[PDB]
Enzyme design. Structure first.
Site, short mmCIF file in Angstrom:
data_model
loop_
_atom_site.label_atom_id
_atom_site.label_comp_id
_atom_site.label_asym_id
_atom_site.label_seq_id
_atom_site.Cartn_x
_atom_site.Cartn_y
_atom_site.Cartn_z
N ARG B 151 0.81 -1.21 0.00
CA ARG B 151 0.00 0.00 0.00
C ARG B 151 0.84 1.26 0.00
O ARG B 151 0.33 2.33 -0.35
CB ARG B 151 -0.93 0.02 1.21
CG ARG B 151 -2.17 -0.81 1.03
CD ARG B 151 -2.78 -1.17 2.36
NE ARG B 151 -4.09 -1.78 2.22
CZ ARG B 151 -4.29 -3.02 1.81
NH1 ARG B 151 -3.27 -3.80 1.50
NH2 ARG B 151 -5.53 -3.49 1.71
N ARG B 255 -10.79 -9.85 1.91
CA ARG B 255 -12.04 -10.12 1.22
C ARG B 255 -12.59 -11.48 1.58
O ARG B 255 -13.80 -11.63 1.81
CB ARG B 255 -11.82 -10.01 -0.29
CG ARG B 255 -13.10 -9.92 -1.09
CD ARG B 255 -12.81 -9.92 -2.58
NE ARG B 255 -13.99 -10.24 -3.36
CZ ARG B 255 -13.95 -10.71 -4.60
NH1 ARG B 255 -12.79 -10.91 -5.20
NH2 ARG B 255 -15.08 -10.97 -5.25
N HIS B 327 -8.27 -20.84 -17.93
CA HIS B 327 -9.03 -20.42 -16.76
C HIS B 327 -10.46 -20.87 -17.01
O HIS B 327 -11.10 -20.39 -17.95
CB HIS B 327 -8.93 -18.91 -16.55
CG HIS B 327 -9.84 -18.38 -15.49
ND1 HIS B 327 -9.84 -18.86 -14.20
CD2 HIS B 327 -10.79 -17.42 -15.53
CE1 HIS B 327 -10.74 -18.22 -13.49
NE2 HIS B 327 -11.33 -17.33 -14.27
N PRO B 328 -10.99 -21.78 -16.19
CA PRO B 328 -12.24 -22.47 -16.55
C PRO B 328 -13.38 -21.51 -16.84
O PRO B 328 -13.83 -20.78 -15.96
CB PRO B 328 -12.52 -23.34 -15.32
CG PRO B 328 -11.78 -22.68 -14.21
CD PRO B 328 -10.54 -22.13 -14.84
N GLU B 357 -19.33 -24.87 -14.36
CA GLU B 357 -19.29 -24.41 -15.74
C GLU B 357 -20.46 -24.95 -16.55
O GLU B 357 -21.03 -24.22 -17.38
CB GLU B 357 -17.97 -24.83 -16.40
CG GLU B 357 -16.74 -24.28 -15.71
CD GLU B 357 -16.80 -22.79 -15.52
OE1 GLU B 357 -16.58 -22.32 -14.38
OE2 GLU B 357 -17.07 -22.07 -16.50
N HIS B 360 -23.47 -22.73 -16.27
CA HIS B 360 -23.47 -21.62 -17.22
C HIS B 360 -23.85 -22.10 -18.61
O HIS B 360 -24.58 -21.42 -19.34
CB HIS B 360 -22.10 -20.94 -17.25
CG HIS B 360 -21.76 -20.20 -16.00
ND1 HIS B 360 -20.46 -19.86 -15.68
CD2 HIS B 360 -22.53 -19.74 -14.99
CE1 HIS B 360 -20.46 -19.22 -14.53
NE2 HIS B 360 -21.70 -19.14 -14.09
N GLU B 384 -24.21 -16.21 -12.07
CA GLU B 384 -23.35 -16.90 -11.12
C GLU B 384 -24.15 -17.60 -10.04
O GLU B 384 -23.72 -18.64 -9.54
CB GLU B 384 -22.36 -15.92 -10.51
CG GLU B 384 -21.16 -15.63 -11.39
CD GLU B 384 -20.24 -16.83 -11.52
OE1 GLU B 384 -20.10 -17.59 -10.54
OE2 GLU B 384 -19.65 -17.01 -12.60
N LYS B 463 -14.45 1.13 7.85
CA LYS B 463 -13.91 -0.21 8.06
C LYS B 463 -13.89 -0.58 9.53
O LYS B 463 -14.03 -1.76 9.86
CB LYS B 463 -12.50 -0.31 7.48
CG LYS B 463 -12.44 -1.15 6.22
CD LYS B 463 -11.22 -2.04 6.20
CE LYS B 463 -11.31 -3.03 5.07
NZ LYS B 463 -10.27 -4.09 5.17
N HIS B 487 -10.86 -4.72 -8.48
CA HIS B 487 -12.12 -4.22 -9.00
C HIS B 487 -12.26 -2.71 -8.86
O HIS B 487 -13.19 -2.13 -9.42
CB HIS B 487 -13.29 -4.91 -8.31
CG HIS B 487 -13.30 -6.39 -8.50
ND1 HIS B 487 -14.20 -7.03 -9.34
CD2 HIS B 487 -12.52 -7.37 -7.98
CE1 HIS B 487 -13.97 -8.33 -9.31
NE2 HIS B 487 -12.95 -8.56 -8.50
N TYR B 497 -21.53 -9.12 -6.40
CA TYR B 497 -21.06 -10.12 -5.44
C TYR B 497 -21.87 -10.11 -4.16
O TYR B 497 -21.72 -11.02 -3.34
CB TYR B 497 -19.59 -9.91 -5.13
CG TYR B 497 -18.70 -10.02 -6.34
CD1 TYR B 497 -18.22 -11.25 -6.76
CD2 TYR B 497 -18.34 -8.90 -7.06
CE1 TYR B 497 -17.41 -11.36 -7.86
CE2 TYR B 497 -17.52 -9.00 -8.17
CZ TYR B 497 -17.06 -10.23 -8.57
OH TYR B 497 -16.25 -10.33 -9.67
#
Ligand SMILES: *[C@@H]1O[C@H](CO)[C@@H](O[C@@H]2O[C@H](CO)[C@@H](O)[C@H](O)[C@H]2NC(C)=O)[C@H](O)[C@H]1NC(C)=O
Ligand SMILES: *[C@@H]1O[C@H](CO)[C@@H](O[C@@H]2O[C@H](CO)[C@@H](O)[C@H](O)[C@H]2NC(C)=O)[C@H](O)[C@H]1NC(C)=O
Ligand SMILES: *[C@@H]1O[C@H](CO)[C@@H](O[C@@H]2O[C@H](CO)[C@@H](O)[C@H](O)[C@H]2NC(C)=O)[C@H](O)[C@H]1NC(C)=O
Ligand SMILES: *[C@@H]1O[C@H](CO)[C@@H](O[C@@H]2O[C@H](CO)[C@@H](O)[C@H](O)[C@H]2NC(C)=O)[C@H](O)[C@H]1NC(C)=O
Ligand SMILES: *[C@@H]1O[C@H](CO)[C@@H](O[C@@H]2O[C@H](CO)[C@@H](O)[C@H](O)[C@H]2NC(C)=O)[C@H](O)[C@H]1NC(C)=O
Ligand SMILES: *[C@@H]1O[C@H](CO)[C@@H](O)[C@H](O)[C@H]1NC(C)=O
Lengths: 98, 597
Positions: B151, B255, B327-328, B357, B360, B384, B463, B487, B497
């Site tokens: 940081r 996260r 990357h699946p 997968e 989807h 998702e 926070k 992001h 999310y």
């Protein structure tokens, strides 16, 4: 053909619905709006042919399917084209129905 | 000749040409992603640029039809999805400046370098080494050094860029009648003109704030438990009534708490169910996995694979020299061509990723009859959720013991039950406060309520108050801590999310009642039931043709997102935690700080 087969050209724009067993090969420009376009593409005037993009890596339902449409007509002709029959054999010296 | 009939005439031609060009672009992108060469890059860029140019020209052409005289709802949806200017409403200098600072931010985040204090020629990037130190190390000082240096040597380059990106995006968003860039983001969940299913762009804030008001009683107990467990690995560093230092959470940002499982496991002498030895015992390969996934999917009432999926898909890593980014992911090239690209090994994680997968893939196969502009989930949080309920219901012991990967009897106990539930809680519940807090901060920044001289102060105040973590070193107003997240610097939304985690359990509880389940919710299995498949297919086949508040009612029975299914799912862990914290102090005080001594 891999890379696109641009020779099949179904039409998607017309002023009216077709009548039974008619053919239309004209290639005039479809006028959508109210302002004439005098035979050039642009706005509200489109080319009425939209050739298929055939490729081998498609899904069933988007692959080419040839079609043949047999249609029969019997107006007044007495003796015409007909199907085949199994020619029999001719016997002799016996009372027969011939 | 009216203004409505010409819209359909335009939409037909647009649909056809768009399908063609999009298929070409997607095929180029796939051929690049599966076989990396140098000429494939240019062959992909050509088709991509052609598709983008066609899209831009059709967009600037579509502005002739006023959205006020349209009467059909599908035509209006397609036009409004096509008429949006997006960017390029600015001037040219501003657009070039915006693209330049976007690329500069992405590059700074991607190749940032930090190195040691005593050996300055030992610099480590982020991905290979920093989020590995932060993930596997158990030393306090090393984790603190990594968390502080990332940081201090990368976040300090992103502040003068973010301060300009904010103003540029705010101008671009006010040029489209949106009052800020945050409203432009929340405009995805908007629904107008349905007479019974309306949803304003400002009600999302209230809905999120009311659904987060009921997860606090569970997050507090989870926080207290993790704190009482962390007071043993780093003694005299955590206080029994304070927050948690932000570098002892598992990764760089906090996260996911999923890396704290080795320290805070409830019963460490019962191994959780992991069928990897049995797969190598029966010699499972990269194809039997997908055969089993397809069998599970067709069991519930969904169609087979399209038979073009088996020859074109890349289910195994190509050997000799075929450098491939596996990357699946599930591809939707269009015109009935579905493919899957993933490097499958023989494990359990791949056995669940296959189901994820193929979820989807099934969703994409569902709505393939809609027009081109209406082929997507009801919103950014449906795809998702649908892809995740499958892997949720496909990892139960009751399902694993019928395929053949488990012994025939295998009596289940409650200790492994609690182990699994807690391992699930550290990933599902440990991220909802973080996501909510970050998106609240970004909304307040864009709206103009947090002046640019109170960014870090408000960030750390929130926070401390919401997430419940405290920083180990004071951060003045030269740093930019959020900008060090993928992001945030790459300009991606983050509220998906949060709504996905609610939709997932809403769908799971809605399907558990059609299959007529009896016990707890975390033992559900939807397989061998044609009612769950029918209820799910009544929603999968809609795409964006209907407002999402109607596609949601066709499954669960309500219109708005709810939080009761999540608590019903986590009930047993909740009771166990509520009986493990009789002596600890549930909650935190926002005054203790690791440096105030
Ligand atoms: C991966 O891409 C490379 C180049 O893009 C391919 O290499 C050649 O591609 C041309 C294209 O017609 C072929 O004629 C050559 O025979 C290829 N060379 C070799 C040594 O095969 C390569 O074939 C591609 N790989 C796959 C699996 O398609
Ligand atoms: C305009 O609206 C009508 C109805 O409001 C739509 O009619 C539907 O058309 C689809 C396919 O064309 C049919 O499957 C439905 O059964 C029709 N519904 C009704 C109630 O008739 C029409 O599709 C709309 N226009 C466009 C371009 O979508
Ligand atoms: C989209 O951008 C255009 C400018 O590129 C905006 O301006 C209108 O563009 C149309 C198309 O030529 C003109 O007929 C109007 O006179 C323009 N000004 C207006 C409508 O005030 C357009 O408004 C933008 N629309 C949206 C929905 O963003
Ligand atoms: C798992 O279940 C067993 C019984 O099925 C629990 O054991 C009992 O726990 C209660 C509550 O602490 C005690 O009063 C009993 O004396 C226990 N019985 C025996 C035979 O030990 C056990 O506590 C449960 N474990 C968890 C984690 O819930
Ligand atoms: C779904 O139902 C089918 C049939 O009802 C199950 O298949 C049978 O399962 C039993 C249970 O061990 C076996 O003895 C049979 O040999 C199976 N038959 C066949 C043809 O395979 C299937 O196991 C069920 N699946 C789930 C997940 O419950
Ligand atoms: C799916 O394919 C299998 C063959 O692998 C076949 O036995 C089964 O009937 C098919 N099911 C459907 C719904 O098409």
């Amino acid at each position: 053909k891999v890379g696109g087969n641009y020779n099949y050209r179904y039409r998607l724009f017309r002023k009216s619905n077709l009548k039974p067993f008619e053919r239309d090969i004209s290639t005039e420009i479809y006028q959508a709006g109210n302002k004439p376009c005098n035979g050039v593409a642009g706005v509200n005037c489109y080319f009425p042919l939209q050739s298929y993009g055939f490729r081998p890596t498609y899904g069933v339902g988007h692959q080419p399917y040839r079609v043949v449409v047999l249609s029969f007509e019997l107006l007044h002709a007495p003796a015409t084209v007909c199907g085949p029959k199994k020619s029999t054999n001719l016997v002799k010296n016996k009372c027969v129905n011939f | 000749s009216t203004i409505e009939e010409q819209a359909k005439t335009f939409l037909d031609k647009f649909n056809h040409e768009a399908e063609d060009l999009f298929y070409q672009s997607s095929l180029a992108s796939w051929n690049y992603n599966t076989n990396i060469t140098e000429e494939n890059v240019q062959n992909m860029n050509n088709a991509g640029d052609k598709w983008s140019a066609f899209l831009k020209e059709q967009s600037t052409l579509a502005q002739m039809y006023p959205l006020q005289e349209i009467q059909n709802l599908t035509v209006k949806l397609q036009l409004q999805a096509l008429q949006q200017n997006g960017s390029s409403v600015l001037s040219e200098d501003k657009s070039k400046r915006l693209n330049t600072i976007l690329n500069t931010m992405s590059t700074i985040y991607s190749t940032g370098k930090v190195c040691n204090p005593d050996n300055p020629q030992e610099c480590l990037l982020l991905e290979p080494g920093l989020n590995e130190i932060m993930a596997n190390s158990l030393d306090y000082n090393e984790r603190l050094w990594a968390w502080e240096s990332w940081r201090s040597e990368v976040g300090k380059q992103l502040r003068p860029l973010y301060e300009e990106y904010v103003v540029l995006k705010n101008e671009m968003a006010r040029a489209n009648h949106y009052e800020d860039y945050g409203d432009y983001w929340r405009g995805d969940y908007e629904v107008n003109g349905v007479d019974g299913y309306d949803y304003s762009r400002g009600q999302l804030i209230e809905d999120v704030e009311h659904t987060f008001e009921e997860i606090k009683p569970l997050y507090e107990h989870l926080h207290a438990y993790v704190r009482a467990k962390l007071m043993n690995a780093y003694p005299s560093y955590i206080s029994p009534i304070g927050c948690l230092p932000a570098h002892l959470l598992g990764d760089m940002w906090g996260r996911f708490w999923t890396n704290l499982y080795s320290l805070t496991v409830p019963f460490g002498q019962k191994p959780n169910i992991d069928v990897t030895d049995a797969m190598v015992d029966q010699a499972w390969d990269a194809q039997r996995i997908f055969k089993e996934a397809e069998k599970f999917f067709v069991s519930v009432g969904l169609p087979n694979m399209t038979q073009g999926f088996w020859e074109n898909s890349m289910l195994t890593d190509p050997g000799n020299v075929q450098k491939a980014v596996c990357h699946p992911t599930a591809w939707d090239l269009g015109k009935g061509d579905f493919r899957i690209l993933m490097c499958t090994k023989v494990t359990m994680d791949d056995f669940l990723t296959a189901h994820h997968e193929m979820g989807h893939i099934q969703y994409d196969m569902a709505y393939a009859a809609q027009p081109f502009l209406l082929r997507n989930g009801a919103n950014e949080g449906f795809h998702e959720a649908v892809g995740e309920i499958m892997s949720l219901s496909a990892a139960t012991p009751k399902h694993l013991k019928s395929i053949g990967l488990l012994s025939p009897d295998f009596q289940e106990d409650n200790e492994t039950e609690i182990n699994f539930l807690l391992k699930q809680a550290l990933t599902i519940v440990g991220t909802l406060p973080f996501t909510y807090m970050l998106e609240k901060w970004r909304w307040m920044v864009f709206k103009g309520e947090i002046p640019k001289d109170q960014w870090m102060k408000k960030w750390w105040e929130m926070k401390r108050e919401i997430v419940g973590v405290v920083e180990p070193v004071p951060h003045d107003e030269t740093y930019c801590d959020p900008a060090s997240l993928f992001h945030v610097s790459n300009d991606y939304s983050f509220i998906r999310y949060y709504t996905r985690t609610l939709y997932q359990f809403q769908f799971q509880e809605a399907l558990c009642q059609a299959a007529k389940h009896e016990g707890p919710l975390h033992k559900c299995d939807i397989s061998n039931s044609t009612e769950a498949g029918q209820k799910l297919f009544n929603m999968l086949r809609l795409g964006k043709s209907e407002p999402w508040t109607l596609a949601l009612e066709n499954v669960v029975g309500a219109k708005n997102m709810n939080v009761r299914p999540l608590l019903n799912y986590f009930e047993p862990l909740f009771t166990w935690l509520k009986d493990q914290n009789k002596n600890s102090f549930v909650g935190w005080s926002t005054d203790w700080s690791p440096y105030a001594d």
